[PDB]
Amino acid sequence: RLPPEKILFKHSSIVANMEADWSRECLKEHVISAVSLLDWAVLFVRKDQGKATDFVNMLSKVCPPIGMEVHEPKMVEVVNDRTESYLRALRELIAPRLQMVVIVFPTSRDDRYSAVKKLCCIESPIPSQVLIARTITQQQKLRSVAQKVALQMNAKLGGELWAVEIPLKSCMVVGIDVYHDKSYGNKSIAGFVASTNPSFTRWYSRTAMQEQSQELIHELKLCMQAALKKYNEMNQSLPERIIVFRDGVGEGREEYVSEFEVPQFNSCFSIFGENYCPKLAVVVVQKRISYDFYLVSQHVRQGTVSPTYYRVIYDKSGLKPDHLQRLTYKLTHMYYNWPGTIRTPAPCNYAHKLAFLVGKSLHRDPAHELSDRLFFL
RNA sequence: UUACCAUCAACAUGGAAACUUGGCU
């Protein structure tokens, strides 16, 4: 087997799991850093009434093993239970006076998901927690669901649960992703994520709405310049190397990417002065079946695995190939929805989920202040 | 919408040939 991904937490060190998702371990160990939950609220409907209160003391129980002294939340109950009820609940009784909110709803579809993601992530910056009352409605199963949910508020508030040791200090990782949706006139949204520390705990996310691909190059140069100045303000240094990912676009536009974006990725990024040429690397990432590499990272319990194809389309880093393969094993960072790892590296699904919320129906842009934390999860 | 999903049923795009009306030209 390849060398694993050792994970470190506050006064603890945990090896990779036998099932390769370190689930049970993070169910019974600490956190690197966790924003304290002091003033927060849950809102419920009486159909889940007892399963409301059996939830909230749950949030006072599982977390001291995870190392997070969570306090009692605030009761909210309001009658109406539609998408417009979600809208008035998320545009009026929602403010930065609260930390972040927990919502239980009986059952719902993707449209109210778009409603909560639109009204939690655009105007008033507060990435609240939405959890349905269908998966917790049975006893002796709320254990793992509530523990994952507890991890999700402790991640999506500015806190940072896990990290991977990085030999490539003073170097960041950038994920750029494109959503392939033609329902809303083929808007073709783009999601950008950039890390703001060599430990990769903090990041920086952005998304703008545009159809065409001519001013797209200039605007993502401006966005990456914002990313580099943010990285310089957090880090007070300069990243020599830069790694840029893909999502799963096939060979129908790989030549188009290599002829258009790759020479433009070296075009006018030397604005910082003189002779500071940054080493760059762009890799194409495929799932279904500078060097190509297949990765086994996710362990499957049902069905056959899908090993992940990597095609480095551009490289100036000079990174060592053994360091490259160990990094590519570790390149599935974070992913605070799913503890452990997946097939594909982290910023691919990260900006893919970002593209999912903005390109479902969100014909707007997320806030700039919602970049340091990981709001979109 | 706790995430990850394994499969199925249906649907838009992308085609591949057959066939009908055919127009052509």
Added chain:
RNA sequence: AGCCAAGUUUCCAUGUUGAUGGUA
């Protein structure tokens, strides 16, 4: 005939709504 359409018929992969089992 060839091409051009109006197309349909099935397959036909990608994306994509539901559901069957689930790992917790």
